[PDB]
C-alpha cells in the first residue's frame, strides 16, 4: 500500500508539472522555459539522451 | 573566496510529448529543474487534463479508505524502502481500476 | 546619633518590590489564562504548547524575590541610612517595572493565542515578541543590584 | 555574499559570552550527543512535538552553543558561582597584621580593611589565566567585573560591527557600484572609526597606563571620555591620559563632523550631472 | 512501573544527579577553607587553629555520597523495571 | 528652618510628579485592543 | 608571575592553529568553510582572553575581606 | 529548570535578534525568490 | 554643612527613570504586538516588515539603562547636595521622555500594521516615522546625559 501511495502521488506530481506547458498553435512538441544551474548541464543532457 | 548563490540560466527545452512522459520523470529523479506556467492567463480547469487529475484524486480517496480500514483492523505496513521504483505507464490506470 | 527610622526604607523597598511584581504577574497571568481558555474551547490541540508564556510570567515575581532577599540580607538594625534609600529605590523600581512587564506580557499573550488558535504558523514569531518583551524584568533586577551594592 | 559560516561561529560565540556557564554547556553537549548517537532512532519517532522538532533542526547549533558556553564559562572563573584557586593567588599577602598595619583589634572592631595594591609585597601581578579567584570574597568584585564586562562588550561589539560593515566591498565591486563605495561605504567607516576606534584605544591604554601608586589621583573609568563628548576643557581633576590628548581629540571631533554631507550630497549631484550629460 | 516513559526520565535524572552529587562530595573532600559560610559553628574553630574544620566537610560529602548511592539504587530499580516489560 | 521649606517643596513636587505618573499609567492601561473581531 | 611569556604561548598556539592549519586542511569542498570557521573561533577566543588578562594589569583600587576570613587565611594560606 | 532552560532560550533569542538586526542590516539587503526545483523529495508526502 | 537627608534625589531619580522607561516600552510592546498578531493571520509574510518597530521599541530601555548606570556610577555623598538635584531631574526627564517615546511607538506600530494589509509600500513610511520617534528619544537621552554628566 505504501508503494502504491508513492506511485500515485508522484504520478499526480507529473500531471502537475505537465500542467505547466507551452500552449502552442499546432506544435505536437513543447518548449518549456525553465531555470536550471549551469553547473550540471552535462548531466542534464546525459539524462535527456538517456 | 566566499559563498554566493550558484549560477543559473534560462533554457528552452524542446520535447515531444512521448519523450516528455520520461523526461519529466528523470528531471524529477534529478531534482534540479524549476518550471513556470507559460500561459498563466488560462484557468486551471481550462487545462484539459483535469480528467486524469480527477481520476488520481479518486485513486487517493480509495487508497485512503483502504488505509483507514487497515488501521481499524490493526494490519501493519512493511515500509522497507527502495524509493526509486518508479515507472510511468498507462497500465497503472487499469491496475488502480 | 544614628539616623532615626533608618531601616524603615529598606524593608519598605523589600515589600514594594515583591508586591508590585506579584500584582503584575497576577494581571498578566489572568489575561493569558482567559485567552488560552477561550482558545482551548475553540482549538483543543495546542493548549500546552501555548501555556509556556503562562508559566514564564512568574519570573518577574522571582526577580522581586531575589531583590527582596538581597535587601533582607543587607538589612539589619544598624542601618547607616546610606543604604536605606538605595533599597527603597531599587525595590520600588524593580517592582513597578515588573508590574508593567507582566501587564504587557498578558496583553500580547492574549492577542497571540487568539491569533494562533486557528493558524499557528506564527508561534515562533509570537514567542519572539514575548521573549523580546521579557527584557524589562532583567533590566529591573540588574539596576536593583547596581543600586543595592552601591 | 551569503555569510552563513561567519554566522555559524559568530552566533554561538556571542550566545556563549552572554551565556557564561559550564554545567549548562556540558548538559547541552550531552543532549546533543544523545541525539547524535540516536539520530535515526529519533527520526523513526514522529516529530509531533514541534518544539522538539525545531530543536532537532537546531541540534548542531545547540552543540556549538554548548561547547562555546563551556569554553567561556571555564574562562570567567564562574563555575557554579564559584572561583577556583587553580594557580597561586598571585598576590602573596602572607602577613596578617602587617601589610594592613593593625594590632589585634579584629572581631571586636577592625572587621574590614581595604588592601591597597600600591603597598609593597601585596600584588605579584595578574592571574595567569582567567579571572582572579580571590574576588570570591571581595565585594568590590561586582564593580570591577561591571567595568570588565562593560569594556568587553564595547570592544567585541565595535569589532564585529566594523567587520559586518566592512564586508560590503565585494557587494559593491561585483555589481559595479562606484556610487555606493566612493562617497558611500568609505565615509561610513570613517565616521564609525573616528567615533569608536579612539574609544577602544583609550580603553586599552587605561588598562596599563596607571597603577595603584597613582590611583587616588588617576582618572575615572569613563567620565573623561564623556567630557570629550561635552566639547569641554576642564581645569580641575585633569590627570590627562597622555601628552597632547586634548590636541588629538579636538581634531578627531572635527574629523567625525566632516562625514555629515556624505551619502547625502554626493549621490544626487553626481547622478544629476551624469543625467544632464546624458540628455 | 511508575510510568515507562516517566521511568526513562527518572533514570536520566539519576544519571545526572549522581555525578552532580559526586562532584559535590569531591569538593567537600577538597575543603580548602573555601565554604566557611557552609559551616554550622559559633566561634568553635577560632581556637586551636584550623582543626575540626575538615571532618564536617567529610560529613557533608558522606551525605552527598549516600544520596548518590540511593539514587543509583533507585536507578538500578528503574533499570530492572524497564527491563521487566 | 529649611526642614519645613524642603518638606513642603518636596511634597508639592512629588504630588505633581505622581499625578503625572498615574495619568500616564491610566492612559496606557485602558486603550483599545487592535483586533479584527470577525470570528466571535 | 611572568607578564609576557604565557601571553606569548597562547598567542603562538592560536596563531599556529590559525595559519599553519589551513594548509594542513585537505583541499575539499569544506576547505574554506572549515578554514574560516577555525580562524573566526581562534581570533574570537584570542580577543576574549586577551581582554580578560589585560583588564587585571596595573589595578588602581583594592579589594576587601572580613576578619574571620583574615584569621582563617592566615592559618591556611 | 530555570537558569538552564529559560535563561538559555532568552539569551538565544536576544543574541539572534541582535545578530539579525545589526549584522545583516549593515551589508545584507534586498529580496529574492528561493529556488524550488521539482523533485521526488516528497517521499512521505 | 551637609544637612541630614542628602542622598535621595539621584536614587529616586534612577528609580523613577527606569520605571517610566519600562512603562513606555511595555505599553508600546503590548499594543504593537497585539496589532501584529491580529494583522498577520491574513498576510503571513510581513513578519519581517512588522518586526522593525518591535526592534526599535527597545531604544527607550537602552537609554534608561545607560543613563541609570551613569547616575549610579556618579551616585555618592562626597558633594554638598549640588549634583543630587541634577540626578533626580535627569532621571525624571529621561523617564517621561521614554513614556512619550513608548506611546508614539505603540500607536505608530498599530497604525503601520493596520495599513500594511493592502499596500506593500507602507514599510518605507513606517521606517521613516520610526526614525522620527527615535530622533525624539535620542533628544531625550542627550538632555539626560548633559544634565547627569554636569
PDB file of C-alpha atoms in Angstrom, chain I residues 4-145:
ATOM      1  CA  UNK I   4      20.805  65.308  57.186  1.00  0.00           C
ATOM      2  CA  UNK I   5      18.900  63.903  54.249  1.00  0.00           C
ATOM      3  CA  UNK I   6      21.221  64.395  51.298  1.00  0.00           C
ATOM      4  CA  UNK I   7      21.108  61.203  49.281  1.00  0.00           C
ATOM      5  CA  UNK I   8      17.518  60.871  47.939  1.00  0.00           C
ATOM      6  CA  UNK I   9      17.499  62.803  44.622  1.00  0.00           C
ATOM      7  CA  UNK I  10      19.671  60.570  42.367  1.00  0.00           C
ATOM      8  CA  UNK I  11      18.471  57.275  43.842  1.00  0.00           C
ATOM      9  CA  UNK I  12      14.773  58.016  43.344  1.00  0.00           C
ATOM     10  CA  UNK I  13      15.739  59.672  40.053  1.00  0.00           C
ATOM     11  CA  UNK I  14      17.223  56.473  38.655  1.00  0.00           C
ATOM     12  CA  UNK I  15      14.323  54.507  40.137  1.00  0.00           C
ATOM     13  CA  UNK I  16      11.660  56.692  38.522  1.00  0.00           C
ATOM     14  CA  UNK I  17      13.613  56.957  35.261  1.00  0.00           C
ATOM     15  CA  UNK I  18      13.768  53.234  34.687  1.00  0.00           C
ATOM     16  CA  UNK I  19      10.212  52.736  35.977  1.00  0.00           C
ATOM     17  CA  UNK I  20       8.930  55.119  33.317  1.00  0.00           C
ATOM     18  CA  UNK I  21      11.131  53.605  30.618  1.00  0.00           C
ATOM     19  CA  UNK I  22       9.595  50.237  31.492  1.00  0.00           C
ATOM     20  CA  UNK I  23       6.103  51.767  31.363  1.00  0.00           C
ATOM     21  CA  UNK I  24       6.627  53.202  27.891  1.00  0.00           C
ATOM     22  CA  UNK I  25       8.360  50.147  26.456  1.00  0.00           C
ATOM     23  CA  UNK I  26       5.738  47.805  27.915  1.00  0.00           C
ATOM     24  CA  UNK I  27       2.814  49.828  26.553  1.00  0.00           C
ATOM     25  CA  UNK I  28       4.356  50.110  23.101  1.00  0.00           C
ATOM     26  CA  UNK I  29       5.217  46.415  23.049  1.00  0.00           C
ATOM     27  CA  UNK I  30       1.726  45.392  24.167  1.00  0.00           C
ATOM     28  CA  UNK I  31      -0.136  47.493  21.615  1.00  0.00           C
ATOM     29  CA  UNK I  32       2.167  46.886  18.647  1.00  0.00           C
ATOM     30  CA  UNK I  33       2.297  43.164  19.408  1.00  0.00           C
ATOM     31  CA  UNK I  34      -1.485  42.938  19.581  1.00  0.00           C
ATOM     32  CA  UNK I  35      -1.756  44.754  16.259  1.00  0.00           C
ATOM     33  CA  UNK I  36       0.823  42.482  14.638  1.00  0.00           C
ATOM     34  CA  UNK I  37      -0.713  39.267  15.979  1.00  0.00           C
ATOM     35  CA  UNK I  38      -4.097  40.438  14.708  1.00  0.00           C
ATOM     36  CA  UNK I  39      -2.868  41.500  11.252  1.00  0.00           C
ATOM     37  CA  UNK I  40      -0.541  38.614  10.467  1.00  0.00           C
ATOM     38  CA  UNK I  41      -3.269  35.955  10.106  1.00  0.00           C
ATOM     39  CA  UNK I  42      -4.248  37.396   6.718  1.00  0.00           C
ATOM     40  CA  UNK I  43      -0.885  38.152   5.048  1.00  0.00           C
ATOM     41  CA  UNK I  44       1.761  35.960   6.738  1.00  0.00           C
ATOM     42  CA  UNK I  45       4.991  37.091   5.101  1.00  0.00           C
ATOM     43  CA  UNK I  46       5.148  40.559   6.715  1.00  0.00           C
ATOM     44  CA  UNK I  47       6.597  39.296   9.999  1.00  0.00           C
ATOM     45  CA  UNK I  48       9.858  40.708   8.651  1.00  0.00           C
ATOM     46  CA  UNK I  49       8.229  44.079   7.913  1.00  0.00           C
ATOM     47  CA  UNK I  50       6.475  44.329  11.277  1.00  0.00           C
ATOM     48  CA  UNK I  51       9.487  43.196  13.320  1.00  0.00           C
ATOM     49  CA  UNK I  52      11.202  46.556  12.699  1.00  0.00           C
ATOM     50  CA  UNK I  53       9.044  48.687  15.073  1.00  0.00           C
ATOM     51  CA  UNK I  54       9.352  45.879  17.622  1.00  0.00           C
ATOM     52  CA  UNK I  55      13.129  46.185  17.467  1.00  0.00           C
ATOM     53  CA  UNK I  56      13.052  49.959  17.695  1.00  0.00           C
ATOM     54  CA  UNK I  57      10.826  49.628  20.779  1.00  0.00           C
ATOM     55  CA  UNK I  58      13.960  48.870  22.841  1.00  0.00           C
ATOM     56  CA  UNK I  59      15.611  52.277  22.371  1.00  0.00           C
ATOM     57  CA  UNK I  60      13.867  53.600  25.485  1.00  0.00           C
ATOM     58  CA  UNK I  61      15.112  50.665  27.553  1.00  0.00           C
ATOM     59  CA  UNK I  62      18.657  51.083  26.217  1.00  0.00           C
ATOM     60  CA  UNK I  63      18.555  54.793  27.033  1.00  0.00           C
ATOM     61  CA  UNK I  64      17.246  54.145  30.531  1.00  0.00           C
ATOM     62  CA  UNK I  65      19.940  51.556  31.193  1.00  0.00           C
ATOM     63  CA  UNK I  66      22.741  53.849  30.003  1.00  0.00           C
ATOM     64  CA  UNK I  67      21.563  56.902  31.946  1.00  0.00           C
ATOM     65  CA  UNK I  68      20.709  54.897  35.075  1.00  0.00           C
ATOM     66  CA  UNK I  69      24.125  53.222  35.092  1.00  0.00           C
ATOM     67  CA  UNK I  70      25.779  56.622  34.620  1.00  0.00           C
ATOM     68  CA  UNK I  71      23.840  58.073  37.557  1.00  0.00           C
ATOM     69  CA  UNK I  72      24.650  55.005  39.663  1.00  0.00           C
ATOM     70  CA  UNK I  73      28.351  55.481  38.924  1.00  0.00           C
ATOM     71  CA  UNK I  74      28.061  59.161  39.861  1.00  0.00           C
ATOM     72  CA  UNK I  75      25.918  58.446  42.943  1.00  0.00           C
ATOM     73  CA  UNK I  76      27.764  59.439  46.122  1.00  0.00           C
ATOM     74  CA  UNK I  77      27.668  61.639  49.229  1.00  0.00           C
ATOM     75  CA  UNK I  78      31.016  63.424  48.777  1.00  0.00           C
ATOM     76  CA  UNK I  79      29.272  66.503  47.373  1.00  0.00           C
ATOM     77  CA  UNK I  80      27.360  69.168  49.280  1.00  0.00           C
ATOM     78  CA  UNK I  81      23.942  68.413  47.787  1.00  0.00           C
ATOM     79  CA  UNK I  82      24.574  70.118  44.430  1.00  0.00           C
ATOM     80  CA  UNK I  83      24.574  67.225  41.954  1.00  0.00           C
ATOM     81  CA  UNK I  84      21.876  65.113  43.604  1.00  0.00           C
ATOM     82  CA  UNK I  85      19.273  67.551  42.234  1.00  0.00           C
ATOM     83  CA  UNK I  86      20.736  67.002  38.773  1.00  0.00           C
ATOM     84  CA  UNK I  87      20.409  63.251  39.194  1.00  0.00           C
ATOM     85  CA  UNK I  88      16.725  63.431  40.217  1.00  0.00           C
ATOM     86  CA  UNK I  89      15.863  65.791  37.399  1.00  0.00           C
ATOM     87  CA  UNK I  90      17.750  63.862  34.733  1.00  0.00           C
ATOM     88  CA  UNK I  91      16.106  60.640  35.869  1.00  0.00           C
ATOM     89  CA  UNK I  92      12.634  62.146  35.659  1.00  0.00           C
ATOM     90  CA  UNK I  93      13.497  63.742  32.311  1.00  0.00           C
ATOM     91  CA  UNK I  94      14.636  60.541  30.635  1.00  0.00           C
ATOM     92  CA  UNK I  95      11.777  58.580  32.194  1.00  0.00           C
ATOM     93  CA  UNK I  96       8.990  60.836  30.961  1.00  0.00           C
ATOM     94  CA  UNK I  97      10.733  61.156  27.597  1.00  0.00           C
ATOM     95  CA  UNK I  98      10.668  57.365  27.466  1.00  0.00           C
ATOM     96  CA  UNK I  99       6.940  57.450  28.184  1.00  0.00           C
ATOM     97  CA  UNK I 100       6.452  59.849  25.260  1.00  0.00           C
ATOM     98  CA  UNK I 101       8.529  57.609  23.010  1.00  0.00           C
ATOM     99  CA  UNK I 102       6.714  54.447  24.081  1.00  0.00           C
ATOM    100  CA  UNK I 103       3.281  55.930  23.428  1.00  0.00           C
ATOM    101  CA  UNK I 104       4.316  57.124  19.970  1.00  0.00           C
ATOM    102  CA  UNK I 105       5.954  53.776  19.156  1.00  0.00           C
ATOM    103  CA  UNK I 106       2.918  51.747  20.200  1.00  0.00           C
ATOM    104  CA  UNK I 107       0.378  53.742  18.231  1.00  0.00           C
ATOM    105  CA  UNK I 108       2.749  54.024  15.248  1.00  0.00           C
ATOM    106  CA  UNK I 109       3.159  50.254  15.208  1.00  0.00           C
ATOM    107  CA  UNK I 110      -0.604  49.776  15.313  1.00  0.00           C
ATOM    108  CA  UNK I 111      -1.090  52.311  12.517  1.00  0.00           C
ATOM    109  CA  UNK I 112       1.538  50.810  10.230  1.00  0.00           C
ATOM    110  CA  UNK I 113       0.467  47.224  10.790  1.00  0.00           C
ATOM    111  CA  UNK I 114      -3.145  48.224  10.155  1.00  0.00           C
ATOM    112  CA  UNK I 115      -2.274  49.966   6.898  1.00  0.00           C
ATOM    113  CA  UNK I 116       0.059  47.203   5.727  1.00  0.00           C
ATOM    114  CA  UNK I 117      -2.836  44.881   4.825  1.00  0.00           C
ATOM    115  CA  UNK I 118      -3.296  46.171   1.258  1.00  0.00           C
ATOM    116  CA  UNK I 119      -0.399  48.346   0.105  1.00  0.00           C
ATOM    117  CA  UNK I 120       3.149  46.895   0.107  1.00  0.00           C
ATOM    118  CA  UNK I 121       4.666  50.392   0.137  1.00  0.00           C
ATOM    119  CA  UNK I 122       3.857  51.321   3.722  1.00  0.00           C
ATOM    120  CA  UNK I 123       7.059  49.921   5.255  1.00  0.00           C
ATOM    121  CA  UNK I 124       9.078  52.894   3.971  1.00  0.00           C
ATOM    122  CA  UNK I 125       6.916  55.492   5.707  1.00  0.00           C
ATOM    123  CA  UNK I 126       6.768  53.118   8.669  1.00  0.00           C
ATOM    124  CA  UNK I 127      10.571  53.124   8.978  1.00  0.00           C
ATOM    125  CA  UNK I 128      10.523  56.893   8.484  1.00  0.00           C
ATOM    126  CA  UNK I 129       8.076  57.609  11.318  1.00  0.00           C
ATOM    127  CA  UNK I 130      10.089  55.173  13.433  1.00  0.00           C
ATOM    128  CA  UNK I 131      13.242  57.173  12.687  1.00  0.00           C
ATOM    129  CA  UNK I 132      11.336  60.305  13.707  1.00  0.00           C
ATOM    130  CA  UNK I 133      10.261  58.952  17.091  1.00  0.00           C
ATOM    131  CA  UNK I 134      13.790  57.615  17.569  1.00  0.00           C
ATOM    132  CA  UNK I 135      15.052  61.157  16.980  1.00  0.00           C
ATOM    133  CA  UNK I 136      12.721  62.336  19.747  1.00  0.00           C
ATOM    134  CA  UNK I 137      14.013  59.649  22.106  1.00  0.00           C
ATOM    135  CA  UNK I 138      17.619  60.474  21.242  1.00  0.00           C
ATOM    136  CA  UNK I 139      16.963  64.124  22.073  1.00  0.00           C
ATOM    137  CA  UNK I 140      15.644  62.895  25.415  1.00  0.00           C
ATOM    138  CA  UNK I 141      18.730  60.838  26.199  1.00  0.00           C
ATOM    139  CA  UNK I 142      21.005  63.687  25.115  1.00  0.00           C
ATOM    140  CA  UNK I 143      19.378  66.110  27.553  1.00  0.00           C
ATOM    141  CA  UNK I 144      19.582  63.459  30.271  1.00  0.00           C
ATOM    142  CA  UNK I 145      23.291  62.915  29.602  1.00  0.00           C
TER     143      UNK I 145
END
